[PDB]
Short mmCIF file of all heavy atoms in Angstrom, two decimals:
data_model
loop_
_atom_site.label_atom_id
_atom_site.label_comp_id
_atom_site.label_asym_id
_atom_site.label_seq_id
_atom_site.Cartn_x
_atom_site.Cartn_y
_atom_site.Cartn_z
N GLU A 192 0.81 -1.22 0.00
CA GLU A 192 0.00 0.00 0.00
C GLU A 192 0.85 1.29 0.00
O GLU A 192 0.34 2.34 -0.34
CB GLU A 192 -1.00 -0.03 1.16
CG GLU A 192 -1.97 -1.24 1.18
CD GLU A 192 -2.50 -1.58 2.59
OE1 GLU A 192 -2.29 -0.78 3.53
OE2 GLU A 192 -3.12 -2.66 2.76
N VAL A 193 2.14 1.20 0.36
CA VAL A 193 3.00 2.39 0.44
C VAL A 193 4.19 2.32 -0.51
O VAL A 193 5.26 2.87 -0.23
CB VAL A 193 3.53 2.59 1.88
CG1 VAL A 193 2.41 2.97 2.83
CG2 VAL A 193 4.25 1.35 2.37
N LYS A 194 4.01 1.63 -1.63
CA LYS A 194 5.05 1.49 -2.67
C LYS A 194 5.72 2.83 -3.03
O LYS A 194 6.94 2.92 -3.04
CB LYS A 194 4.47 0.86 -3.95
CG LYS A 194 5.47 0.04 -4.79
N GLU A 195 4.93 3.87 -3.32
CA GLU A 195 5.50 5.14 -3.78
C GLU A 195 6.34 5.79 -2.70
O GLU A 195 7.42 6.31 -3.00
CB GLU A 195 4.46 6.14 -4.33
CG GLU A 195 3.85 5.78 -5.70
CD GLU A 195 4.88 5.35 -6.80
OE1 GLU A 195 5.25 4.15 -6.84
OE2 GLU A 195 5.28 6.20 -7.65
N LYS A 196 5.88 5.76 -1.45
CA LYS A 196 6.66 6.35 -0.35
C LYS A 196 7.95 5.57 -0.07
O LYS A 196 8.98 6.18 0.23
CB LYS A 196 5.79 6.49 0.90
CG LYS A 196 4.62 7.48 0.72
CD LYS A 196 3.25 6.85 1.10
CE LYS A 196 2.08 7.84 0.95
NZ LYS A 196 2.15 8.92 1.97
N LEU A 197 7.92 4.24 -0.20
CA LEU A 197 9.15 3.44 -0.08
C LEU A 197 10.17 3.84 -1.10
O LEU A 197 11.36 3.98 -0.78
CB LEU A 197 8.88 1.98 -0.32
CG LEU A 197 8.25 1.32 0.86
CD1 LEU A 197 7.70 -0.05 0.42
CD2 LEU A 197 9.29 1.22 1.97
N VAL A 198 9.72 3.97 -2.35
CA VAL A 198 10.62 4.33 -3.43
C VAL A 198 11.21 5.72 -3.15
O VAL A 198 12.41 5.93 -3.29
CB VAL A 198 9.92 4.31 -4.80
CG1 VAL A 198 10.81 4.91 -5.84
CG2 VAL A 198 9.57 2.89 -5.19
N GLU A 199 10.37 6.65 -2.71
CA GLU A 199 10.82 7.96 -2.26
C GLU A 199 11.89 7.89 -1.14
O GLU A 199 12.83 8.69 -1.13
CB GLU A 199 9.59 8.73 -1.75
CG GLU A 199 8.82 9.51 -2.80
CD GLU A 199 9.27 10.94 -2.85
OE1 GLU A 199 9.20 11.61 -1.80
OE2 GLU A 199 9.72 11.40 -3.93
N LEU A 200 11.73 6.97 -0.18
CA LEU A 200 12.68 6.81 0.90
C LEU A 200 13.96 6.07 0.50
O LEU A 200 15.05 6.53 0.86
CB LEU A 200 12.05 6.06 2.06
CG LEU A 200 10.96 6.72 2.91
CD1 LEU A 200 10.32 5.67 3.86
CD2 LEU A 200 11.51 7.91 3.69
N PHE A 201 13.85 4.94 -0.21
CA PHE A 201 14.99 4.01 -0.39
C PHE A 201 15.45 3.81 -1.82
O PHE A 201 16.36 3.04 -2.05
CB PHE A 201 14.70 2.63 0.22
CG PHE A 201 14.33 2.67 1.68
CD1 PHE A 201 13.05 2.27 2.10
CD2 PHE A 201 15.23 3.11 2.63
CE1 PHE A 201 12.69 2.32 3.44
CE2 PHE A 201 14.86 3.15 3.97
CZ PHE A 201 13.57 2.74 4.37
N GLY A 202 14.82 4.48 -2.78
CA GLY A 202 15.14 4.33 -4.20
C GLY A 202 14.39 3.20 -4.89
O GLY A 202 13.66 2.44 -4.26
N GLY A 203 14.60 3.07 -6.20
CA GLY A 203 13.96 2.03 -6.99
C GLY A 203 14.43 0.62 -6.69
O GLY A 203 13.73 -0.35 -7.00
N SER A 204 15.60 0.49 -6.09
CA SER A 204 16.18 -0.83 -5.78
C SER A 204 15.37 -1.70 -4.79
O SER A 204 15.33 -2.94 -4.89
CB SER A 204 17.57 -0.62 -5.19
OG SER A 204 17.49 0.12 -3.99
N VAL A 205 14.76 -1.05 -3.82
CA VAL A 205 13.78 -1.77 -3.00
C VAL A 205 12.78 -2.55 -3.87
O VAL A 205 11.97 -3.30 -3.33
CB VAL A 205 13.01 -0.87 -1.98
CG1 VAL A 205 13.89 -0.52 -0.85
CG2 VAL A 205 12.45 0.39 -2.63
N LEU A 206 12.85 -2.38 -5.20
CA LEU A 206 11.99 -3.10 -6.12
C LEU A 206 12.75 -4.13 -6.98
O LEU A 206 13.98 -4.08 -7.09
CB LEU A 206 11.26 -2.10 -7.02
CG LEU A 206 10.71 -0.77 -6.44
CD1 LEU A 206 10.35 0.17 -7.60
CD2 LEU A 206 9.52 -0.96 -5.50
N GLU A 207 11.99 -5.04 -7.61
CA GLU A 207 12.57 -6.08 -8.45
C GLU A 207 12.24 -5.78 -9.90
O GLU A 207 13.15 -5.62 -10.74
CB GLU A 207 12.07 -7.47 -8.01
CG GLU A 207 12.60 -8.68 -8.82
CD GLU A 207 13.87 -9.33 -8.26
OE1 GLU A 207 13.78 -10.01 -7.21
OE2 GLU A 207 14.95 -9.21 -8.91
N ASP A 208 10.95 -5.69 -10.22
CA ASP A 208 10.51 -5.01 -11.46
C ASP A 208 9.82 -3.71 -11.04
O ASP A 208 10.48 -2.78 -10.56
CB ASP A 208 9.60 -5.89 -12.31
CG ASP A 208 10.38 -6.89 -13.15
OD1 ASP A 208 11.28 -7.55 -12.59
OD2 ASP A 208 10.09 -6.99 -14.37
N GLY A 209 8.49 -3.64 -11.15
CA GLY A 209 7.77 -2.48 -10.64
C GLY A 209 7.36 -2.73 -9.21
O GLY A 209 6.48 -2.02 -8.70
N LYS A 210 8.02 -3.70 -8.57
CA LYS A 210 7.45 -4.44 -7.41
C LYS A 210 8.28 -4.38 -6.13
O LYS A 210 9.48 -4.61 -6.14
CB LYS A 210 7.22 -5.93 -7.79
CG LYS A 210 6.20 -6.11 -8.94
CD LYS A 210 6.45 -7.36 -9.75
CE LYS A 210 5.60 -7.37 -10.99
NZ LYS A 210 5.76 -8.64 -11.77
N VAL A 211 7.61 -4.07 -5.02
CA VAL A 211 8.20 -4.19 -3.69
C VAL A 211 8.72 -5.60 -3.49
O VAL A 211 8.00 -6.56 -3.69
CB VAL A 211 7.19 -3.89 -2.57
CG1 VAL A 211 7.78 -4.23 -1.16
CG2 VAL A 211 6.74 -2.46 -2.65
N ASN A 212 9.99 -5.69 -3.15
CA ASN A 212 10.74 -6.92 -2.87
C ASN A 212 11.36 -6.90 -1.49
O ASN A 212 12.33 -6.18 -1.22
CB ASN A 212 11.88 -7.12 -3.87
CG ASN A 212 12.53 -8.46 -3.69
OD1 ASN A 212 13.33 -8.67 -2.77
ND2 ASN A 212 12.15 -9.40 -4.54
N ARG A 213 10.84 -7.75 -0.62
CA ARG A 213 11.26 -7.73 0.78
C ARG A 213 12.73 -8.10 1.02
O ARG A 213 13.34 -7.57 1.96
CB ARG A 213 10.36 -8.61 1.58
CG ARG A 213 8.90 -8.25 1.42
CD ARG A 213 8.10 -8.61 2.64
NE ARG A 213 7.91 -10.05 2.75
CZ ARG A 213 6.96 -10.73 2.13
NH1 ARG A 213 6.11 -10.12 1.30
NH2 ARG A 213 6.88 -12.04 2.30
N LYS A 214 13.30 -8.98 0.17
CA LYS A 214 14.70 -9.37 0.33
C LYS A 214 15.59 -8.13 0.09
O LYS A 214 16.44 -7.82 0.93
CB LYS A 214 15.08 -10.55 -0.60
CG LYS A 214 14.42 -11.89 -0.23
CD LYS A 214 15.07 -13.10 -0.94
NZ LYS A 214 13.24 -16.09 -0.70
N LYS A 215 15.34 -7.40 -1.00
CA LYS A 215 16.11 -6.20 -1.30
C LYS A 215 15.90 -5.11 -0.25
O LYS A 215 16.84 -4.41 0.11
CB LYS A 215 15.83 -5.65 -2.73
CG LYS A 215 16.64 -6.39 -3.87
CD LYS A 215 16.80 -5.57 -5.16
N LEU A 216 14.69 -5.00 0.28
CA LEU A 216 14.39 -3.99 1.27
C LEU A 216 15.07 -4.31 2.61
O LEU A 216 15.66 -3.43 3.27
CB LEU A 216 12.87 -3.84 1.44
CG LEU A 216 12.35 -2.80 2.43
CD1 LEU A 216 12.93 -1.43 2.20
CD2 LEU A 216 10.83 -2.72 2.34
N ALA A 217 14.98 -5.57 3.01
CA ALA A 217 15.71 -6.07 4.18
C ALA A 217 17.22 -5.85 4.08
O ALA A 217 17.86 -5.54 5.09
CB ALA A 217 15.40 -7.55 4.37
N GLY A 218 17.77 -6.03 2.87
CA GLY A 218 19.18 -5.75 2.62
C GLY A 218 19.54 -4.31 3.00
O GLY A 218 20.62 -4.04 3.51
N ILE A 219 18.62 -3.40 2.77
CA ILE A 219 18.82 -2.00 3.05
C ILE A 219 18.60 -1.69 4.50
O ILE A 219 19.47 -1.12 5.15
CB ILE A 219 17.86 -1.15 2.20
CG1 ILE A 219 18.26 -1.31 0.73
CG2 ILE A 219 17.84 0.31 2.68
CD1 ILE A 219 17.48 -0.45 -0.22
N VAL A 220 17.42 -2.03 5.01
CA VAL A 220 17.02 -1.57 6.34
C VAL A 220 17.77 -2.27 7.47
O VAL A 220 17.99 -1.68 8.52
CB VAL A 220 15.51 -1.66 6.61
CG1 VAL A 220 14.75 -0.88 5.55
CG2 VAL A 220 15.04 -3.09 6.69
N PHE A 221 18.19 -3.51 7.26
CA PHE A 221 18.93 -4.19 8.33
C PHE A 221 20.42 -3.94 8.28
O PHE A 221 21.17 -4.65 8.95
CB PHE A 221 18.64 -5.71 8.36
CG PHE A 221 17.24 -6.05 8.76
CD1 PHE A 221 16.42 -6.78 7.93
CD2 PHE A 221 16.73 -5.62 9.98
CE1 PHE A 221 15.11 -7.07 8.31
CE2 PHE A 221 15.42 -5.91 10.36
CZ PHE A 221 14.61 -6.64 9.52
N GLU A 222 20.87 -2.95 7.52
CA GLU A 222 22.28 -2.54 7.58
C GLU A 222 22.45 -1.28 8.42
O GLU A 222 23.57 -0.93 8.77
CB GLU A 222 22.90 -2.37 6.17
N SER A 223 21.33 -0.64 8.77
CA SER A 223 21.32 0.64 9.47
C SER A 223 20.09 0.80 10.37
O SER A 223 18.95 0.50 9.97
CB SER A 223 21.33 1.75 8.43
OG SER A 223 21.39 3.02 9.04
N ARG A 224 20.30 1.30 11.59
CA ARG A 224 19.18 1.67 12.46
C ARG A 224 18.42 2.88 11.93
O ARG A 224 17.18 2.96 12.05
CB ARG A 224 19.66 1.91 13.89
CG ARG A 224 20.10 0.62 14.53
CD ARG A 224 20.98 0.84 15.75
NE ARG A 224 21.05 -0.40 16.53
CZ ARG A 224 21.27 -0.46 17.84
NH1 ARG A 224 21.47 0.66 18.56
NH2 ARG A 224 21.30 -1.65 18.44
N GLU A 225 19.15 3.82 11.33
CA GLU A 225 18.55 5.00 10.72
C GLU A 225 17.54 4.56 9.64
O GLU A 225 16.40 5.03 9.61
CB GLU A 225 19.64 5.93 10.14
N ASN A 226 17.93 3.62 8.78
CA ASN A 226 17.06 3.16 7.69
C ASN A 226 15.84 2.42 8.23
O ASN A 226 14.69 2.61 7.76
CB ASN A 226 17.79 2.18 6.75
CG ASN A 226 18.87 2.83 5.87
OD1 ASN A 226 18.80 3.99 5.48
ND2 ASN A 226 19.85 2.02 5.50
N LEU A 227 16.09 1.55 9.20
CA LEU A 227 15.02 0.77 9.77
C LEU A 227 14.01 1.72 10.43
O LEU A 227 12.81 1.53 10.27
CB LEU A 227 15.52 -0.33 10.72
CG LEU A 227 14.47 -1.28 11.31
CD1 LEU A 227 13.89 -2.22 10.23
CD2 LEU A 227 15.04 -2.09 12.44
N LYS A 228 14.47 2.77 11.12
CA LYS A 228 13.54 3.70 11.74
C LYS A 228 12.67 4.35 10.68
O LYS A 228 11.49 4.51 10.89
CB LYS A 228 14.27 4.79 12.54
CG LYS A 228 13.32 5.70 13.35
CD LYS A 228 14.08 6.67 14.30
CE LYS A 228 13.29 6.93 15.62
NZ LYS A 228 14.11 7.62 16.69
N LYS A 229 13.25 4.72 9.55
CA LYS A 229 12.48 5.36 8.48
C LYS A 229 11.35 4.49 8.00
O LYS A 229 10.25 4.99 7.73
CB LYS A 229 13.35 5.62 7.26
CG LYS A 229 14.30 6.72 7.39
CD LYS A 229 15.19 6.80 6.14
CE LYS A 229 16.33 7.80 6.37
NZ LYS A 229 17.02 8.22 5.12
N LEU A 230 11.61 3.19 7.85
CA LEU A 230 10.57 2.25 7.44
C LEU A 230 9.50 2.07 8.52
O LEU A 230 8.32 2.12 8.23
CB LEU A 230 11.17 0.91 7.09
CG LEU A 230 10.20 -0.22 6.76
CD1 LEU A 230 9.37 0.14 5.55
CD2 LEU A 230 10.96 -1.53 6.54
N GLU A 231 9.92 1.90 9.76
CA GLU A 231 9.01 1.75 10.89
C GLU A 231 8.06 2.94 11.00
O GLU A 231 6.87 2.76 11.18
CB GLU A 231 9.81 1.56 12.19
CG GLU A 231 10.62 0.25 12.23
CD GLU A 231 11.22 -0.07 13.60
OE1 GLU A 231 11.90 0.77 14.24
OE2 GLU A 231 11.01 -1.21 14.06
N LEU A 232 8.58 4.16 10.86
CA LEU A 232 7.75 5.37 10.91
C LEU A 232 6.71 5.39 9.81
O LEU A 232 5.64 5.93 9.98
CB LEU A 232 8.59 6.63 10.72
CG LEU A 232 9.36 7.22 11.89
CD1 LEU A 232 9.61 8.69 11.63
CD2 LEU A 232 8.65 7.06 13.24
N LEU A 233 7.04 4.81 8.68
CA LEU A 233 6.09 4.73 7.57
C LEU A 233 5.01 3.64 7.77
O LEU A 233 3.83 3.89 7.51
CB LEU A 233 6.83 4.45 6.27
CG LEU A 233 5.97 4.16 5.03
CD1 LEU A 233 5.12 5.38 4.73
CD2 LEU A 233 6.82 3.72 3.83
N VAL A 234 5.39 2.43 8.21
CA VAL A 234 4.46 1.27 8.19
C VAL A 234 3.80 0.92 9.54
O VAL A 234 2.69 0.43 9.57
CB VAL A 234 5.09 -0.01 7.49
CG1 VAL A 234 5.59 0.34 6.11
CG2 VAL A 234 6.21 -0.60 8.28
#
């Protein structure tokens, strides 16, 4: 439901095609507390 805001926060890479991909997103957010907080505040 928040695809556009994710892309705004983390770039197009959080995606696989036009699609939210949890493996790629986890790669991003679990490398940083700052990133994880940004996602938590959104969802």
Side-chain angles (χ1 to χ4, degrees), residues 192-193 195-213 216-221 223-224 226-234:
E192 303 155 10
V193 292
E195 288 313 85
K196 295 127 179 291
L197 282 167
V198 170
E199 273 265 302
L200 291 170
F201 304 116
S204 62
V205 285
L206 320 166
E207 180 92 72
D208 279 48
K210 298 152 190 184
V211 172
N212 187 283
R213 305 208 287 276
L216 181 52
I219 294 185
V220 304
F221 293 121
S223 183
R224 291 161 163 207
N226 289 330
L227 184 70
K228 186 173 215 168
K229 287 175 189 195
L230 175 61
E231 295 190 308
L232 279 203
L233 172 63
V234 307

